[PDB]
């Protein structure tokens, strides 16, 4: 509920010290929360390649993003997740000005996301496994969890659609 309404979500973000909006990319942080105040940033994904706002290709790590601003995307995401006492998996989406080197809160998805497997490739984590373990109060011990990101990974979404006739759905056997 607190994340569903565009404006309640902005207050939490503000209180969490997450820079908000006072040629845009879409950089999101995959975060895990244990439901008891602990939160951890697992990595970031770029989801810029969208058609009329519908994602088709995603990648990790985000290209052309400096550590200074990635590490502060992570920490801002952990504050937001901590503040809520967030449980299981959520994503903090940001807008990113590549040129200005600035990012701004967009929304939290209060759920796992379609693109989650690229994160799983570079870290070797099974996020569903984590979700299950956290949801049963047998959470990984967060303060002692070292996440190593390894290589780069990208996802393409195969749709039953016709790109030539307006991405009209294409049923059949």
């Amino acid at each position: 509920r607190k994340l569903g309404l565009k404006h309640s979500a902005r207050e939490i973000a503000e209180r969490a010290k997450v820079p908000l909006v006072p040629n845009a990319r879409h950089v999101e942080i995959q975060m895990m929360g244990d439901g008891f105040g602990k939160a951890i940033a697992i990595g970031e994904r770029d989801c810029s390649l969208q058609r009329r706002n519908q994602k088709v290709i995603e990648e990790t790590p985000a290209p052309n993003l400096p550590e200074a601003t990635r590490a502060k995307m992570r920490a801002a995401s952990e504050r937001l997740g901590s503040l809520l006492k967030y449980k299981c998996a959520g994503t903090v989406e940001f807008i990113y000005d590549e040129q200005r080197d600035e990012f701004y809160f967009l929304e939290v998805n209060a759920r796992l996301q379609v693109e989650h497997p690229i994160t799983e490739m570079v870290t070797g984590l099974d996020l569903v496994e984590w979700m299950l373990r956290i949801a049963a109060n047998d959470s990984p011990d967060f303060d002692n969890t070292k996440i190593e990101v390894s290589g780069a990974s990208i996802e393409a979404r195969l749709y039953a659609e016709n790109p030539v006739k307006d991405f009209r759905p294409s049923p059949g056997q």
Side-chain angles (χ1 to χ4, degrees):
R1 262 162 221 128
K2 265 126 93 219
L3 277 336
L5 297 21
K6 4 274 134 76
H7 106 287
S8 37
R10 274 247 176 173
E11 334 225 314
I12 329 252
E14 167 132 344
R15 282 158 58 201
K17 300 168 182 300
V18 172
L20 5 59
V21 163
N23 262 234
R25 288 171 57 189
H26 177 123
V27 184
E28 67 194 13
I29 296 273
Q30 169 75 62
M31 149 252 133
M32 218 55 38
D34 73 355
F36 296 115
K38 260 126 152 216
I40 179 159
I42 297 215
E44 87 289 358
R45 301 180 290 248
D46 186 299
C47 298
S48 324
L49 294 169
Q50 293 174 39
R51 179 196 80 75
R52 281 225 308 164
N53 272 74
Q54 306 164 66
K55 308 197 263 214
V56 336
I57 273 113
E58 319 92 0
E59 73 176 304
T60 203
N64 298 318
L65 172 82
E67 287 284 341
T69 159
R70 166 172 27 258
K72 106 170 56 149
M73 267 165 153
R74 292 163 58 74
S77 291
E78 309 194 337
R79 290 190 296 268
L80 199 160
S82 275
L83 186 90
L84 287 137
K85 255 108 177 270
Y86 196 100
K87 210 180 214 181
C88 300
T91 301
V92 189
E93 320 200 316
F94 304 107
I95 315 190
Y96 181 55
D97 201 310
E98 185 168 6
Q99 275 210 340
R100 286 157 74 156
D101 193 70
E102 312 291 40
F103 65 97
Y104 323 116
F105 180 74
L106 180 68
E107 60 183 322
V108 180
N109 311 131
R111 54 173 174 74
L112 191 71
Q113 280 179 301
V114 185
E115 55 272 33
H116 79 280
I118 59 171
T119 300
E120 294 185 346
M121 288 280 97
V122 305
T123 68
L125 296 184
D126 175 344
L127 295 184
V128 171
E129 177 181 353
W130 273 55
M131 292 180 57
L132 288 163
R133 288 194 39 185
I134 286 165
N137 302 335
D138 176 281
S139 153
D141 146 37
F142 279 19
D143 313 306
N144 292 319
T145 313
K146 192 180 168 79
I147 284 153
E148 30 227 20
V149 27
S150 191
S153 168
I154 133 105
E155 170 176 82
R157 307 204 182 173
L158 192 78
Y159 286 100
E161 262 167 6
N162 191 358
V164 173
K165 300 318 271 313
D166 290 296
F167 306 85
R168 159 192 165 95
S170 173
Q173 195 175 33

